Amino acid sequence: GMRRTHYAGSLRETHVGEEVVLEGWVNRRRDLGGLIFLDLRDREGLVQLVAHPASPAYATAERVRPEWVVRAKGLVRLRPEPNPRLATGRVEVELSALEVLAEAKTPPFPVDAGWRGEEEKEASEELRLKYRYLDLRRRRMQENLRLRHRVIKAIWDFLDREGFVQVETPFLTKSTPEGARDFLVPYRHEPGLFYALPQSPQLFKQMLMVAGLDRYFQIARCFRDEDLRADRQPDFTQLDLEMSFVEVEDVLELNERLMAHVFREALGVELPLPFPRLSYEEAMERYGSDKPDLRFGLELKEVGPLFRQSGFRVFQEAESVKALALPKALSRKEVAELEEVAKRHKAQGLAWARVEEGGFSGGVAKFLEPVREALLQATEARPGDTLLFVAGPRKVAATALGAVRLRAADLLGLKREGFRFLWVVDFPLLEWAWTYMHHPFTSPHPEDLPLLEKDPGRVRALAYDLVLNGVEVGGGSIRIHDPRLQARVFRLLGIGEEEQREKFGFFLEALEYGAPPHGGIAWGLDRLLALMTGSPSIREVIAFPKNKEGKDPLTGAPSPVPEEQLRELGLMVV
Amino acid sequence: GMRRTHYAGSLRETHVGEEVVLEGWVNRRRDLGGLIFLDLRDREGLVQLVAHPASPAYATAERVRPEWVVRAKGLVRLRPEPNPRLATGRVEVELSALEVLAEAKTPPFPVDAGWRGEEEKEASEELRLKYRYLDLRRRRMQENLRLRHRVIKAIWDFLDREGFVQVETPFLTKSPEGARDFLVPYRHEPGLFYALPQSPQLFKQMLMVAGLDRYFQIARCFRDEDLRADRQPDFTQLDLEMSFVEVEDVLELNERLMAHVFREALGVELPLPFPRLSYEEAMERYGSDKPDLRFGLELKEVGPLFRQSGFRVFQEAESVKALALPKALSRKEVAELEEVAKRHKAQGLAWARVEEGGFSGGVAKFLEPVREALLQATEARPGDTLLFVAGPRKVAATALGAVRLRAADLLGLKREGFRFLWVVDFPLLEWDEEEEAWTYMHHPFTSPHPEDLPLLEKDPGRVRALAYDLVLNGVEVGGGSIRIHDPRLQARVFRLLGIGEEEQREKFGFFLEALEYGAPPHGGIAWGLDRLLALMTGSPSIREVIAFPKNKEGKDPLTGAPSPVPEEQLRELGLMVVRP
Numbered sequence A: 001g002m003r004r005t006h007y008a009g010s011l012r013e014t015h016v017g018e019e020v021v022l023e024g025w026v027n028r029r030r031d032l033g034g035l036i037f038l039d040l041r042d043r044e045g046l047v048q049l050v051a052h053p054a055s056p057a058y059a060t061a062e063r064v065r066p067e068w069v070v071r072a073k074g075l076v077r078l079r080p081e082p083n084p085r086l087a088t089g090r091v092e093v094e095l096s097a098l099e100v101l102a103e104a105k106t107p108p109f110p111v112d113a114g115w116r117g118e119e120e121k122e123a124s125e126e127l128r129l130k131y132r133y134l135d136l137r138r139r140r141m142q143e144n145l146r147l148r149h150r151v152i153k154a155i156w157d158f159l160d161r162e163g164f165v166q167v168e169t170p171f172l173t174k175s176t177p178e179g180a181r182d183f184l185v186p187y188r189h190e191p192g193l194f195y196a197l198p199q200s201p202q203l204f205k206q207m208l209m210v211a212g213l214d215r216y217f218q219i220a221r222c223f224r225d226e227d228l229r230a231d232r233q234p235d236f237t238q239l240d241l242e243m244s245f246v247e248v249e250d251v252l253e254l255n256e257r258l259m260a261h262v263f264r265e266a267l268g269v270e271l272p273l274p275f276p277r278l279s280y281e282e283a284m285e286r287y288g289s290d291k292p293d294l295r296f297g298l299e300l301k302e303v304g305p306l307f308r309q310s311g312f313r314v315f316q317e318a319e320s321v322k323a324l325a326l327p328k329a330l331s332r333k334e335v336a337e338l339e340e341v342a343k344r345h346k347a348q349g350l351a352w353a354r355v356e357e358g359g360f361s362g363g364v365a366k367f368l369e370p371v372r373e374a375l376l377q378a379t380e381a382r383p384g385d386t387l388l389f390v391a392g393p394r395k396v397a398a399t400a401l402g403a404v405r406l407r408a409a410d411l412l413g414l415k416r417e418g419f420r421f422l423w424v425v426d427f428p429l430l431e432w433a434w435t436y437m438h439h440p441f442t443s444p445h446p447e448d449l450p451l452l453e454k455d456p457g458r459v460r461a462l463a464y465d466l467v468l469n470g471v472e473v474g475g476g477s478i479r480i481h482d483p484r485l486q487a488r489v490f491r492l493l494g495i496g497e498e499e500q501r502e503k504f505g506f507f508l509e510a511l512e513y514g515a516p517p518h519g520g521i522a523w524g525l526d527r528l529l530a531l532m533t534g535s536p537s538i539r540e541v542i543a544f545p546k547n548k549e550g551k552d553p554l555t556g557a558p559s560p561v562p563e564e565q566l567r568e569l570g571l572m573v574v
Numbered sequence B: 001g002m003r004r005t006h007y008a009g010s011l012r013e014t015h016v017g018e019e020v021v022l023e024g025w026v027n028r029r030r031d032l033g034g035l036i037f038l039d040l041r042d043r044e045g046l047v048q049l050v051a052h053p054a055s056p057a058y059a060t061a062e063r064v065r066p067e068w069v070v071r072a073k074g075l076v077r078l079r080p081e082p083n084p085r086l087a088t089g090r091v092e093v094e095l096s097a098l099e100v101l102a103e104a105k106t107p108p109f110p111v112d113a114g115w116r117g118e119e120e121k122e123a124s125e126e127l128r129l130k131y132r133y134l135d136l137r138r139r140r141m142q143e144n145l146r147l148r149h150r151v152i153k154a155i156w157d158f159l160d161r162e163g164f165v166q167v168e169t170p171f172l173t174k175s176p177e178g179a180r181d182f183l184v185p186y187r188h189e190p191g192l193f194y195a196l197p198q199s200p201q202l203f204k205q206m207l208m209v210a211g212l213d214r215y216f217q218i219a220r221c222f223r224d225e226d227l228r229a230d231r232q233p234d235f236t237q238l239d240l241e242m243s244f245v246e247v248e249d250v251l252e253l254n255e256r257l258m259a260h261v262f263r264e265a266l267g268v269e270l271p272l273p274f275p276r277l278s279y280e281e282a283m284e285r286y287g288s289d290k291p292d293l294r295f296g297l298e299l300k301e302v303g304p305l306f307r308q309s310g311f312r313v314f315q316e317a318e319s320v321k322a323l324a325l326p327k328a329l330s331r332k333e334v335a336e337l338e339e340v341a342k343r344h345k346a347q348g349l350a351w352a353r354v355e356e357g358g359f360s361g362g363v364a365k366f367l368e369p370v371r372e373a374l375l376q377a378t379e380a381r382p383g384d385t386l387l388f389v390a391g392p393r394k395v396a397a398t399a400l401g402a403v404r405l406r407a408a409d410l411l412g413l414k415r416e417g418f419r420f421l422w423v424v425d426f427p428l429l430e431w432d433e434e435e436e437a438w439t440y441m442h443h444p445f446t447s448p449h450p451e452d453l454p455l456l457e458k459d460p461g462r463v464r465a466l467a468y469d470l471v472l473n474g475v476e477v478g479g480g481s482i483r484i485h486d487p488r489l490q491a492r493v494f495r496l497l498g499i500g501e502e503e504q505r506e507k508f509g510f511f512l513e514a515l516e517y518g519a520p521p522h523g524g525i526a527w528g529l530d531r532l533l534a535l536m537t538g539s540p541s542i543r544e545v546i547a548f549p550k551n552k553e554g555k556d557p558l559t560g561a562p563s564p565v566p567e568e569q570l571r572e573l574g575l576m577v578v579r580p
C-alpha cells in the first residue's frame, strides 16, 4: 500500500493519538519559542507539523524551504489554541521523522496564502500561464478544477439515468468553406489534402439520431479559428446533447432538471424549476437584450404612444420611445455617463428627467407634464426617481436603453447575487438577402411555415438560448428532419444544389433514409464554470489555457518545426 | 411530455390491454389477407404493429415502406402465435392511429436482420463507412456503442470514488510517444504550428507537480503512423496519473478498476490479483512481451543439452528454444510454421515426431542421442511434433513464440475468456536488431530502477525500468511507468538517450524547469480504450467500437475527409503545396 496514512488536509481532532505518515509540500516555515512550525500542504489542505528540539526531525525541519516535497511522520496532537481558518485547525503533528523527497526553487509568485484562508495578491496572468503548473498549486485553482470534475460527473450521472448514450465523435473531419474558419491538419500521404478540427459535433449528433440511438451526449471540444477577443479560446468545451421525438418543451424541461441536478450536486445550490421563459421579442422589449440579466429589475417600458400628440418632435415622430425609472436622483455626471453608453449603442441620445412629488424637473420635464398620469402609471415611478428615455428605431432604442440599464445597475450599486437562469425562445429564423442565425438545420415554427416565402422576417425558429446572469451559456434548436423542408429552406436562402452537396451532401443524403424528429442543445461548459465560480475569465476554469492572444506561454506553442518535418508533409512557407 | 409511452422493444405481456403510443422505424412490412404487419423498431428492439382494413390507421399504413419513421397508437394484445425469437414476441399492437414522421428510400445494405435475432450477412466495410449512419442502425453496432458508454461511466464511478480528478488537457499543444505529430498551422504567423497531442503525458506529470495528487482523463491521442496493424489516426486512452506511488500501487489500483469495469459493463468477474510476469520471464516462457495466457504450449530452453552435439547449428547457438505440440503436423503445416518462424528473423524451424519408442521425421536423427533428458524437459508424448529455433536468445524466443501463436490457430485450440496479466521489469533500453542501436521501450520520462542508477554510465543495457504493460489475451491494452521527478536524473537519462542540452531545452525545457520547483514522486498508466472494447466485444477491429472511424488509409468515406481546401484558404495560412 501507500506510505502515507492520510491526506494532510484531512486530519481532525478525531485523529488525535494516532501515528500518521504524510507527504506534501512545505507551505511555510516559522520558528517560535525554540519550536519549528511547518505548514504541510496537499490537495485537501494544510496541517501544522511541530518539531521539538529533542526530535530526530529537528535539524531537517530547520533546513527545509517553501515548496520542498517532504514525507513527515509523527503523532496527531491537539493545538493549545485552534486556528479556525484551517479545517485541521484544532490539531498539529508532533514530528518524529522528516524526510526531504524533493527540493524546490523559489517560485516566481506565492501559492501559499489561499491554503491559509488569506487573500492572495493578483499576479501577472502571463506569469501565471508561463508557470501554470505552479499557478495550479493555488487553492482557488484546485477548487475550480475539482468543481469542473464534479459538474461533469453530475452530468454523466443524470444523463445516464435518463437513458442518454455518450458517443465520441471525430476530431479529424471534413473542412468546409462554410462560415467560421477551420483549423486544418495536413494529410501526410497526399499533400494538398487536409483534415479539419470540428467546429461542433452538430452533423454527427444529428446522424446519431438518424441511426436510432434516440438520445446522445458528449463533453465535446470545439475548435473555431476566429477572433480571440471577448475572452474566446481557440478551443472550448461544450456539453453537447441531442434527442429524438421531442418538442421544444421536451428539450427545455430535460435541460432544466439536468442543470438543477448539476447545481445541487456540484455547488450545493437549489435552483427553483421551471426556469422563466421569454420570447426573443419579450426579452428585447423588456430588457433590451437577448441575454437578460434577471438579477435586478428596472425593466424597459415602451412609452412611444404617449407622445404622439406631444409638441416634443423627437419623441412624437420616433418609431419607439423606451423609458427606464432609476430609484435614485442621478448626478449630471452619471446621466452623461449613461448618455454616452446609449450613444455608444447607436442611439441619437438619452433624454432624462427627475420626478418630484407634484411633477418633473430637469431635462425633458416640460414635455412630460401633459402625460404625467399616464407616464407614471406605465413606469410605476415614484418621487425621487430619475426617468431615462431613448427615442429611435425599435431595435436601437431597446438595445441602447438595455445597455444603459446594465450600466445603471453598477452606478446604483444594486446587489446582484445568485444564479438567475432563463430561456430565450422564438428567435427569428433569419435576418436580412436572407441569412440564418446559427446553422441552417434549425426548424421553422410549424405554424409559421406558410410565411417562409411570403414574410420571411416574421418566421420564428424552434430555437432557444439558455441564459445565466446576462450571459449566454447554451444554445440549440429543433432540427429539420424533412429533406423537402430542408431543401425548401435552402431555396429561400438562395443556396443552390452544387453548394449544398459541397457543404452538406453527406448529411442531406442521410435525411433521405428516414430521419426522426429531433433536436438538441450545447452548453458552453467553460462559460458555465466561470460563472459558477465568479471567475472573470474562462481561463480560470481551464487547466492549461491559451493566453488572450492565442499562444501558450507554458510550452511555447505555436512553435516552428524543422524544415525536414514540414518537407515530409509536402508543404512549405510562402 | 413525450407522445411516446414506451420504447417499442420494451413491450411485454404485462402490457396487454394498455393503449400505447410508439415511435420508431419500420424494420419490415408484410401483407397478409388484408392485414398489414409492421415490425416497429427503436433502440430497445422490435414490436409487431397490426393495421386492420377497418382501422383509420389503414390508409396511412398502406404507404409505409421499410425504414420509414412513424408514430403509432393502439392497444397491446397477445399474438395468436408468439414469436419466441423476440422479447416482445408474445404481444402485438392493434393500430388505431398511424402517422408518417419521415419517409425513407431503400438502404444500400440491410439493417433489419440483427433486430430479429437473425444472422447478418457481411457487407463491404467501405460501404458501411460511407453510410455509417445506416450501419449504426444495426443491433450489434448499437450494442457496441452502448457498451462503450457503460465502460466509460464505470471508469468515472470507480476513479471518482478513489479520489481521482478528471482534468481535460490541451489539443493545440507543443510539437512524444514514438510517432509523427499531426500539425495545425498557426494562421497569424506562417511557419508556426501547433501539434495535436500524441498523449497527455507531460500535462499529467505537470498536474502532479501542481499537487492534484491523482488525475484521469478519457483522452484522445493523435499519432501519424504508417497505419498498418489496424491503426487509426486518432484513438482513445484512459489516461491516469498518481503521486507518491510505487509500481505496486499503480498496478493494484488498475487491477481493481478493470475488475470493476468488467463486472459492471459485461457482468464478468475477473479474479484478482492479475498474474505478473517479468519481461524476461514472459520472453522465456512465451517468446512475447504480450503473452496469450489462454493456452499453454510454453517454450523450453534446451541449448545446454547440445553442448556435445554434432549438430553445429544447435551447438554454436546462444539459445535453442523448443516447443512440443500435441499433434503430428503435415509437412505443409510444418512449412507454414517454418515460414512464420523465418518471417521473425529465425534461421529456420526444425521438426520431428514422437513415436512409441523412437522418433521420426525431420531432424529426428540429431534428437535421438539425447532422449531421456529431452522428454523430461519438453513433456512430449507419442504423436507430438517437436519444433526448434536456434539463435540469439531474443530471436529464438520471439520466433518460436510466433510459431506458438500460429500453431494455436492451426490446431484449433478453444481459447476462451479474458486472461489479463502484467508484464513488469522492462529494460530501460530495447535493442533494435535492424538499426543496431539502443532505443527506449517506453518514453524518455520513465524512471530507471533506483538500484541501477550507477549502471546508467557503466552498463546501460543492464538497466531496468520502473515500467509495466497490461496485457489481455496477447494484446497490449495498457502501458505506464514510474516517472523521473529529479531534474538532474531526467537530464542524465536524456543524455543517455542521445539528447544533448540543446535538444533538451528546445523540446522539454519547460518541463525540466517544472521539475526544479519540487516535483513529487509520481507514476501512471494509459489504457487503449478502443483496443479493450474491441476485445470485450470479440470485434476483429477497433473500427467496430468507434462511432465514426476512418478506413485503413485514414480517410473518411462518409464525409470526404481529408480533402483539398480552396487556394484562398491555403494562401491565408502562408503555406503552399510543394511541386513534385
Ligand SMILES: N[C@@H](CC(=O)O)C(=O)NS(=O)(=O)OC[C@H]1O[C@@H](n2ccc(=O)[nH]c2=O)[C@H](O)[C@@H]1O
Pocket (backbone or CB within 6 Å): A199, A200, A201, A202, A232, A233, A236, A237, A238, A438, A472, A473, A474, A475, A476, A477, A520, A521, A522, A523, A524, A525, A526, A527
Ligand atoms: N451545434 C450548436 C448547438 C446546437 O444547435 O445544438 C452550436 O455549437 N451552437 S453555438 O455555436 O451557439 O454554441 C452553443 C453554446 O456554446 C457556447 N460557446 C460558443 C462559442 C464559443 O466560442 N464559446 C462557447 O462557450 C455558448 O454558450 C453557446 O450558446
Ligand SMILES: N[C@@H](CC(=O)O)C(=O)NS(=O)(=O)OC[C@H]1O[C@@H](n2ccc(=O)[nH]c2=O)[C@H](O)[C@@H]1O
Pocket (backbone or CB within 6 Å): B177, B198, B199, B200, B201, B223, B231, B232, B235, B237, B240, B443, B476, B477, B478, B479, B480, B481, B524, B525, B526, B527, B528, B529, B530, B531
Ligand atoms: N504516455 C504513455 C502512458 C503512460 O506512460 O502513462 C503512453 O501513451 N503509452 S503508449 O504509447 O504505450 O500507449 C498506452 C496504450 O495505448 C494503447 N494504444 C497505443 C497506440 C495506438 O495506436 N493505439 C492504442 O490503443 C495501447 O493499449 C498502449 O498500451
